[PDB]
């Protein structure tokens, strides 16, 4: 139990009680030579992702991906960090390899849509996010990307229902509500945006997007 | 996850027209004073 408790404690959510997660990470690193473990790396990548440390995300995830390039737990954070750094060649290579590796997974089609978004081709991302969303109902990234494709396309009425639908399927995740509030900003409807921004900020006290909005 | 591109404020036409007008009366102020 001395090691099992820490291993279980690793996998909970990172937004709250973050410091204990780090302390447990170093606890695992000492006396158990489990620093090379993949799941410790996943925990650190998600930790860096929470504070938007995208460069540290890329370096560590490139170190872990060289050993294994198709760990579906690892990949979503890597795709997000690639899209944040806005580099298209690495995303293109990874997405095209994953497309020919796992054709029936939603992650690869989500990656193709992200590549098109890095290329600003909203029309193809529409279909290639719809496919990923259909393939996996529990893939919140697909709903947020889908509503983003509506928003960047030019029309927002359908994106409104898309962000609302994303919020309803996944209660307790602030980010779809935050994106929906930004769409309310885009439509100049601030009354609902006040409450929505407050609810999102209830669990995200320190992040650039919430404070900027 | 796909982070949204943050919204960016835009320099409207109305406020810049207001400022350019204010500058026109600003220069018009001392031209009669000089005379």
Curated annotation (Swiss-Prot), chain A:
Disulfide bonds: none annotated. Phosphorylated by CDC28, which is required for the early mitotic activity of the APC/C in its CDC20-bound form. It is found in: Nucleus. GO terms for cellular component: anaphase-promoting complex; cytoplasm; cytosol; nucleus. Changing residue 105 to P: In CDC16-183; G2/M cell cycle arrest at 37 degrees Celsius. The keyword Kinase does not apply. TPR repeats lie at residues 1-29, 39-67, 74-101, 106-135, 140-168, 175-203. Keywords: Cell cycle, Cell division, Mitosis, Nucleus, Phosphoprotein, Repeat, TPR repeat, Ubl conjugation pathway. GO terms for biological process: anaphase-promoting complex-dependent catabolic process; cell division; negative regulation of DNA-templated DNA replication initiation; positive regulation of mitotic metaphase/anaphase transition; protein ubiquitination; regulation of meiotic cell cycle; regulation of mitotic cell cycle. The APC/C is composed of at least 13 subunits that stay tightly associated throughout the cell cycle: APC1, APC2, APC4, APC5, APC9, APC11, CDC16, CDC23, CDC26, CDC27, DOC1, MND2 and SWM1. Interacts with AMA1. Present with 2753 molecules/cell in log phase SD medium. Belongs to the APC6/CDC16 family. This is Anaphase-promoting complex subunit CDC16. It comes from Saccharomyces cerevisiae (strain ATCC 204508 / S288c) (Baker's yeast).
From Swiss-Prot, chain B:
Component of the anaphase promoting complex/cyclosome (APC/C), a cell cycle-regulated E3 ubiquitin-protein ligase complex that controls progression through mitosis and the G1 phase of the cell cycle. The APC/C is thought to confer substrate specificity and, in the presence of ubiquitin-conjugating E2 enzymes, it catalyzes the formation of protein-ubiquitin conjugates that are subsequently degraded by the 26S proteasome. The chain holds residues 1 to 35 of 124 of the full protein. The modification Phosphoserine is found at residue 12. Belongs to the CDC26 family. It is found in: Nucleus. The APC/C is composed of at least 13 subunits that stay tightly associated throughout the cell cycle: APC1, APC2, APC4, APC5, APC9, APC11, CDC16, CDC23, CDC26, CDC27, DOC1, MND2 and SWM1. CDC26 is required to tether the essential subunits APC9, CDC27 and CDC16 to the complex. This is Anaphase-promoting complex subunit CDC26. It comes from Saccharomyces cerevisiae (strain ATCC 204508 / S288c) (Baker's yeast). It comes from the Eukaryota.
